[PDB]
Amino acid sequence: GCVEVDSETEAVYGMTFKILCISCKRRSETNAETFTEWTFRQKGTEEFVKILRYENEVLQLEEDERFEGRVVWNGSRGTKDLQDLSIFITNVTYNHSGDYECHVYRLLFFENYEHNTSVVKKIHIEVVDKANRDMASIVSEIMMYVLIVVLTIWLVAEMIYCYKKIAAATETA
Amino acid sequence: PDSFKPFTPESLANIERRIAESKLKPKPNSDLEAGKSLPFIYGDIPQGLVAVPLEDFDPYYLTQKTFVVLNRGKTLFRFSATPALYILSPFNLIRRIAIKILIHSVFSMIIMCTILTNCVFMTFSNPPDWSKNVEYTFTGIYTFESLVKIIARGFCIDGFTFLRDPWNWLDFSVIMMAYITEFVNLGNVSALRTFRVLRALKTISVIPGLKTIVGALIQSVKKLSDVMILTVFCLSVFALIGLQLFMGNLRNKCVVWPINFNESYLENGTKGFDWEEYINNKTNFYTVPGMLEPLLCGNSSDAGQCPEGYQCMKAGRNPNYGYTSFDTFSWAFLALFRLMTQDYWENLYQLTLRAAGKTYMIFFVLVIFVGSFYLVNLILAVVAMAYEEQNQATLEEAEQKEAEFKAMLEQLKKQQEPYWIKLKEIVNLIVMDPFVDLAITICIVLNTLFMAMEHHPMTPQFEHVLAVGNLVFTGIFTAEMFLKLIAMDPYYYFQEGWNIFDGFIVSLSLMELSLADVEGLSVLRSFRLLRVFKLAKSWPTLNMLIKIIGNSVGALGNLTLVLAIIVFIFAVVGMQLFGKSYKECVCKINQDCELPRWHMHDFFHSFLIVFRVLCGEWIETMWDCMEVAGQAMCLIVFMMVMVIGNLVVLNLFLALLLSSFSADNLAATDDDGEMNNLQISVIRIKKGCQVNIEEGLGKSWWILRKTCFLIVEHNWFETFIIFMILLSSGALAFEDIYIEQRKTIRTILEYADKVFTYIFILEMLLKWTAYGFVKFFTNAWCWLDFLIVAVSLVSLIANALGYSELGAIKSLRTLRALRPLRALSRFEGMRVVVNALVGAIPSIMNVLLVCLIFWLIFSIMGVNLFAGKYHYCFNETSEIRFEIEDVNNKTECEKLMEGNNTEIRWKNVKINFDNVGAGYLALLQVATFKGWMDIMYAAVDSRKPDEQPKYEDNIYMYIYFVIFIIFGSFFTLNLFIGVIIDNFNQQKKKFGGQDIFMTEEQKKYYNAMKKLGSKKPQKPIPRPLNKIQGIVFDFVTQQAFDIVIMMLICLNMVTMMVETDTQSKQMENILYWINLVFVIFFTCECVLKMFALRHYYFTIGWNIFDFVVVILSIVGMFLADIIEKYFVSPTLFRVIRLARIGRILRLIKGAKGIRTLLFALMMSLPALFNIGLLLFLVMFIFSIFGMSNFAYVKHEAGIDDMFNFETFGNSMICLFQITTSAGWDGLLLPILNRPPDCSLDKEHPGSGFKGDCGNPSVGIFFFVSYIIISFLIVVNMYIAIILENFSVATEESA
Ligand SMILES: *[C@@H]1O[C@H](CO)[C@@H](O[C@@H]2O[C@H](CO)[C@@H](O[C@@H]3O[C@H](CO[C@H]4O[C@H](CO[C@H]5O[C@H](CO)[C@@H](O)[C@H](O)[C@@H]5O[C@H]5O[C@H](CO)[C@@H](O)[C@H](O)[C@@H]5O)[C@@H](O)[C@H](O[C@H]5O[C@H](CO)[C@@H](O)[C@H](O)[C@@H]5O)[C@@H]4O)[C@@H](O)[C@H](O[C@H]4O[C@H](CO)[C@@H](O)[C@H](O)[C@@H]4O[C@H]4O[C@H](CO)[C@@H](O)[C@H](O)[C@@H]4O)[C@@H]3O)[C@H](O)[C@H]2NC(C)=O)[C@H](O)[C@H]1NC(C)=O
Ligand SMILES: COCC(CCO[C@H]1CC[C@@]2(C)C(=CC[C@H]3[C@@H]4C[C@@H]5O[C@]6(CC[C@@H](C)CO6)[C@@H](C)[C@@H]5[C@@]4(C)CC[C@@H]32)C1)COC
Ligand SMILES: CC(C)CCC[C@@H](C)[C@H]1CC[C@H]2[C@@H]3CC=C4C[C@@H](OC(=O)CCC(=O)O)CC[C@]4(C)[C@H]3CC[C@]12C
Ligand SMILES: CC(C)CCC[C@@H](C)[C@H]1CC[C@H]2[C@@H]3CC=C4C[C@@H](OC(=O)CCC(=O)O)CC[C@]4(C)[C@H]3CC[C@]12C
């Protein structure tokens, strides 16, 4: 009951966003205790800095003038077993244009067994003033128009050909 | 004629003189023979000359030693003339009295009574103290008859004497055993009681007419010679394939991979890693909570997976106590015999798919199509023609006897030359009116509708109405009967049919009115629904069903009796064999050490197990029996039972089918000569624009329409339309839950939908202008296409305008799954099958009416028996059911539910008889034998409404589920099959064609293959005319050479079964050397046939088959050895090495018994192809619906991480499993979940959908519709293949 999706790279300036970090276990029926940390490295800078840490259904935000008041938790709620570790930022500025690392630490509890798992997710976020439509939509639009029109002209041309032929045959006899 | 004479010594003197004269210097009349009635021409016995020593009455016995006795029942006995044992002279008055005893029907009656009471005593499990004497006299009785027979005749000494008939051997053996183990302390009871059952076989020798039935059964099974060989050959080759593919891929378990070396304890101590024990330790596995066997897995991409910290390896033992396995040829053969008879094959399907990958499903298709669908129908057809021949021969004997009766008639006719009557008629006056009969029928229908109105959660207001209605209807019916009984005669005119039945019903109703409701009333109120059958006089199909039911207890009664005796014998045999073992090893199979639900400790449970294996479920009980009583005895007994009982049931089915066919009618009564009073009752109720086309614009418009029609008819537009339909249908596959991962594909499909709908709109418009409005609207195909395109137009223009989140728009979005329902009118193969089904549909509707009204009676019976008794208190924390001591009823469970105790739940069984609607679903599950286990488990635990069930408190409720299977699942099938056969025969008669499911394009190829099948062979062979010298040419044409090559192929087959998963490396090396030797010998054979014969390598086709299998042999043998360099491909060598079994198909070379069967399969292949294409289309549509609906339900029961509805592949696999109607209950339970179980809101990471609950209505309708459609399609497939088999087998030419 989980699909590992990837967050969108392009983020519009001045409006909200959603950074996706989904890491679900290999078997759903299992139970585990999971907590996450986030590290952000702005472009130009070469060091990752912890920004937030979610654990025991609480969120800890480190001191960072570029992130206080403009980030909220938007992951799984109501349980300690976390598979959605996404965070929601309510105001995208040009500071939030870098590399995000989502470190998810999970402790799986089996019968007479406890397993420690660490997964690191990599997200690239680009901040642009205006949102650009993906090339796939443009290509699909142009192609659908092209096939529609070419099919229309082919159909009318064949109809005209058969019309002339049958009319000539009828007039002849 | 009229020859009677005592066997005086001068008769023996002349007999011996005649034989001496014959020796010194021929067929008995079958009508006379022995043991049958005497022909009428001989007259009657004079005075008291019965049991007198008459002489033989036929030729061929005048000189031989013979001596004839007759009885008052007029049967013929032929004993020997010589004194028995040379001591007892016939006239010394010892043998005369014994013979007089033996010819008396009272002796047979006494023997029958003692046999029945003996078997009744064998029914008892624990031998009571007052039983030994009962056995003793039994033995004393049995030897009695033997003594008489010993007095009657000698021991096989000379002529027709004792110990000649096999039944004489049988009872001689039974008395020998009885007196061997009577007073002798030697003999273990578990070994003598199982042999004591041989007294039950004496029923056939005692009951008249059973011997002929047994002989007929043996004669019917006699013809099963080549089909058995073909079945074993197909099973062997498929088992070899499975063993080579799935070798060891069933013990794959996930063990904890990170090894705690510092904490690797040992039983002896001193730590250590100790491999081959670390993998055999149970605790180092992964078992899904709530399950028993550890989870399987696979190393492939599409196989199963296990959580972090676990990893797959071949460890432990195979599932199902190690019996379900592919590691050995024997186990593979068992597992594939489990597939030919589709019993619990879904478990093996899921296990192999999980442990080897989802790409192996193709294999399970083949075994299903050939090996489980073709072999079974082959066997059924063979038995069918055997029974046809037997029935025909019986008819010939009957008409021959009736014809000789004409000669006898000719001979005899030639040789001949207080005001009671007033009130009687008054109460009669209201009888001979159609109105009273119509009112009675309406009353019965209304009574049925009233009885169908009761449910478990019923208010007092409802029950008062139901009770007063029942009272008034009972009063009306009893008044009708009471008035009938005075009109004709108070004690007479009540035996003319249907007047004893209604009397019995009304008397039961009045008896039920009294006695109050002390006990047993629940079943007592279940016998009135028989008034429904009073409609049979007006319903021809119900009357036919009544005739079918009455044929079993009637003319075809001996077969039913034989089946009952066989079932009883098998039950007592199993109970006496494994009765004690189930208690000694009770927790070899059930961890609680309490006896399981299906044991063999008492007669009732043994009979239930026998009936279950008759129904088709036998492996589950076989494993339990194996785990407690060994493998050999259990396998032998279960195989014997499942063979013999199935054969008897099949014979009874065929006999009832034949009796239901028009042979029953003999013009004894006029065809519906009587008149139905309803017509006269109705009669007496009634008594009291259009512009021309030959103008400037009209002509142009006419050419426009003609050119539109020409464009429609052009066979380049149709192919393009079919391609567009295929593309549009395939575009619906990319709508799984992983759609968020593939954004670009989603966008492309979304934009291509517009192109597709525009194309179809243009096609519809052009078709409108071409065909015309009347022609477009006077056929179903264009109407269906118009409906599809109109719903697409709605979903397009509405979405473009907005309201994409509207409930109506979202509910119309899932209706897009009908897009594949457009190739039906394009493909001729689908269309012919569809229109044949449509033309035949009235008969199935007419019979479905009868089936529904019949099943309604059983549903009401269940409702009045299991209403609200399926509830039970449950503790979710410990997932255990409370016993009767903890809680007793709903009130106690509610008290236990005080405070925050939400773990305690008053749960209800999802499938139950709470009302007629759910009773119908329960009956459907029971009839198909899928999911009935839980229903009968809960039924036998029920005690009373509103109280916790107790384990096996109503054990005798199982009978209710047995009778239904006998009546609702067996005779209804007979009716359906008979009407289908009659309708198809009439369709073939009116059509005039040869096949229904075949297009005109396939009929020419049909006839061409028919000509090919009867083609004769020619063998023109010239000399090589070269240095070959022809010696090898004569060598290859030698029968010894062919025998040698066939024996070598057989040896290769034999050595291909010795491979074992746990074999040592030395055995692998030896097998590799042997296979290499065989391969090099085969290459030498190919070289020998090479360069010595070439001009015949494009005609016969066998040589090119050998040439194409051999090259595959060399590549798979040595290239596979080479691929280890710079390539791995672990699973590919097995596929290549499967080619080694190609040489096994060369046994078909001389296979004239089964070569015709394979040719019949070829002949029927295309008619099966059309139906399979239709079935695949239906599967695709239902799979799209399942993806659209049940892609997010909870993973419970049959729904898991690998067999579910999110993806197209998983849905396809599940639907293919459901096609054979295998475990559809498991895939229906998760949908029936409720908000108390499934969370209404639930986070789904990666998708916007919330919650994991399903719609019970949608799921129920989906599964029921799929079951009905699949049943119809499979029935059509069976009919087609059986017709083709009959056509092939009914051909013979010089
Ligand atoms: C699907 O794919 C999966 C992908 O992985 C696949 O998983 C693989 O499965 C296969 C088999 O199915 C696995 O192969 C087996 O692995 C076992 C694990 O053994 C490991 O530990 C051994 C012991 O460790 C001691 O010695 C090491 C070296 O000396 C040290 O590194 C250890 O620290 C330790 O040292 C000492 O200290 C210990 C305590 O501190 C002390 O107890 C110990 O005694 C010792 O003094 C290692 O030897 C072994 O390493 C060997 O194998 C790895 C490859 O796995 C290579 O590095 C070398 O080959 C190395 O020698 C592992 O680290 C093995 O034990 C097992 O081998 C035994 O059994 C095979 C037959 O099954 C024998 O032929 C063989 O002799 C081995 O020895 C034992 O058995 C024999 C008799 O059988 C007995 O005579 C002997 O005394 C001994 O008891 C085998 O190799 C594989 O590991 C899995 N994963 C990997 C990594 O690939 C899966 O199977 C697939 N599933 C399916 C079916 O789909
Ligand atoms: C002159 O020849 C006339 C003849 C006409 C009839 O041909 C066949 C039509 C199908 C029919 C009626 C025939 C034989 C066995 C019949 C089967 C027995 C099996 O019993 C069942 C019941 C359930 C199980 C116990 C076993 O399977 C059914 C599924 C199976 C069955 C009822 C399906 C229908 C079959 C005859 C051929 O004409 C070309
Ligand atoms: C709102 C929606 C759901 C209405 C559509 C309902 C359809 C299922 C019905 C309505 C009209 C029916 C049609 C009405 C008339 C006919 C003609 C009938 O054939 C004839 O009468 C033969 C005429 C001739 O050839 O002379 C075949 C069925 C058919 C197409 C019917 C098929 C089923 C149809 C399309
Ligand atoms: C070819 C066959 C399938 C035709 C015969 C079908 C009927 C047996 C079905 C079709 C619709 C069903 C009804 C659909 C809905 C309901 C409402 C349902 O009311 C409830 O509240 C359900 C309670 C429950 O779940 O038990 C009671 C059953 C009933 C009347 C069903 C009774 C059985 C019906 C008539």
Ligand SMILES: *[C@@H]1O[C@H](CO)[C@@H](O)[C@H](O)[C@H]1NC(C)=O
């Ligand atoms: C955020 O944005 C400002 C814009 O000038 C930039 O200097 C720096 O990256 C961040 N400063 C603060 C206030 O955090």
Ligand SMILES: *[C@@H]1O[C@H](CO)[C@@H](O)[C@H](O)[C@H]1NC(C)=O
């Ligand atoms: C196993 O334990 C026994 C008893 O402690 C000991 O005698 C033996 O040597 C041990 N074997 C091993 C594997 O060390």
